């Protein structure tokens, strides 16, 4: 599961972007 | 515009900014085969290109490492693009959508500026990202489209 890990890493970034846009 | 159209237009536009003046044959081909109707100089594409570039700059190392492990570990590039897409989109946040679009545009830029990259790798990657990205159409439609998401909201 390198695909698993890439997925999760991108998901984390997606979450960071949301909070970022809220400020 | 579908997600596949906007992603392909962003990749074309990004190639014009970063590259050597020759669009990769793979991008020409996907334009021919998609019917790309959206101009890479359309204002919604320039605006998304800014947002995706900011995400790349802010995540530059993690984008490089994730791309490097993906591409060095895949035996079937286009299938694995569809697998990471599923991992992210399971259920659908704006941040997640953009993280995925920025990651794809970043991967295309990396593939297209490396003159040593084999054609088939560039080809299958651009096809894989475009096809996987279609999974966002239902969600973006419920938001009234990419243009509305940027101009607005």
Residue numbers in the entry:
A (entry chain B): 69 to 91
B (entry chain A): 3 to 93, 96 to 157
Provide the authors' own sentences about this structure as they appear in the paper.
Some viruses, such as Epstein-Barr virus (EBV), encode homologs of the mammalian pro-survival protein Bcl-2. In this study, we have confirmed that EBV BHRF1 exerts its pro-survival function by directly inhibiting a sub-set of pro-apoptotic Bcl-2 family proteins Bid, Bim, Puma and Bak, presumably ones most critical for the virus. We have therefore determined crystal structures of BHRF1 in complex with its key targets, the BH3 domains of Bim and Bak. Our three-dimensional structures show that these interactions closely resemble those seen with mammalian pro-survival proteins such as Bcl-xL.
Recombinant BHRF1 bound a 26-mer Bak BH3 peptide (KD = 150 nM), but only weakly (>1 µM) to Bax BH3. Consistent with the binding data, we observed that BHRF1 could directly counter Bak, but not Bax, when these proteins were expressed in yeast. Taken together with the previous reports that BHRF1 interacts with the full-length Bak, but not with Bax, we conclude that BHRF1 can keep Bak inactive by direct binding, but must inhibit Bax indirectly, presumably by its ability to sequester BH3-only proteins such as Bim. Bak BH3 binds in an equivalent manner, and the two complexes superimpose with an RMSD of only 0.6 Å over the entire BHRF1 backbone indicating their similarities. As the characteristic hydrophobic surface groove was absent in unliganded BHRF1 due to the close proximity of helices α3 and α4, significant structural changes are required in order to accommodate Bim or Bak BH3 domains. These changes affect mainly α4, which is at a 120° angle to α3 in the BH3-bound form, compared to the near anti-parallel alignment in the free form. The side-chain interactions contributing to the BHRF1-BH3 complexes are equivalent to those observed for mammalian pro-survival proteins such as Bcl-xL, with the four conserved hydrophobic BH3 residues of Bim (I58, L62, I65 and F69; numbering based on human BimL) protruding into pockets within the BHRF1 hydrophobic binding groove. Similarly, Bak residues V74, L78, I81 and I85 (numbering based on human Bak) interact with the BHRF1 binding groove. In addition to the hydrophobic interactions, BHRF1 R100 forms a salt bridge with Bim D67 or with Bak D83. The conservation of aspartic acid in the mammalian BH3 ligands suggests that this interaction is of particular importance for complex formation, and indeed a BHRF1 R100A mutation reduces Bim binding and abolishes interaction with Bak.
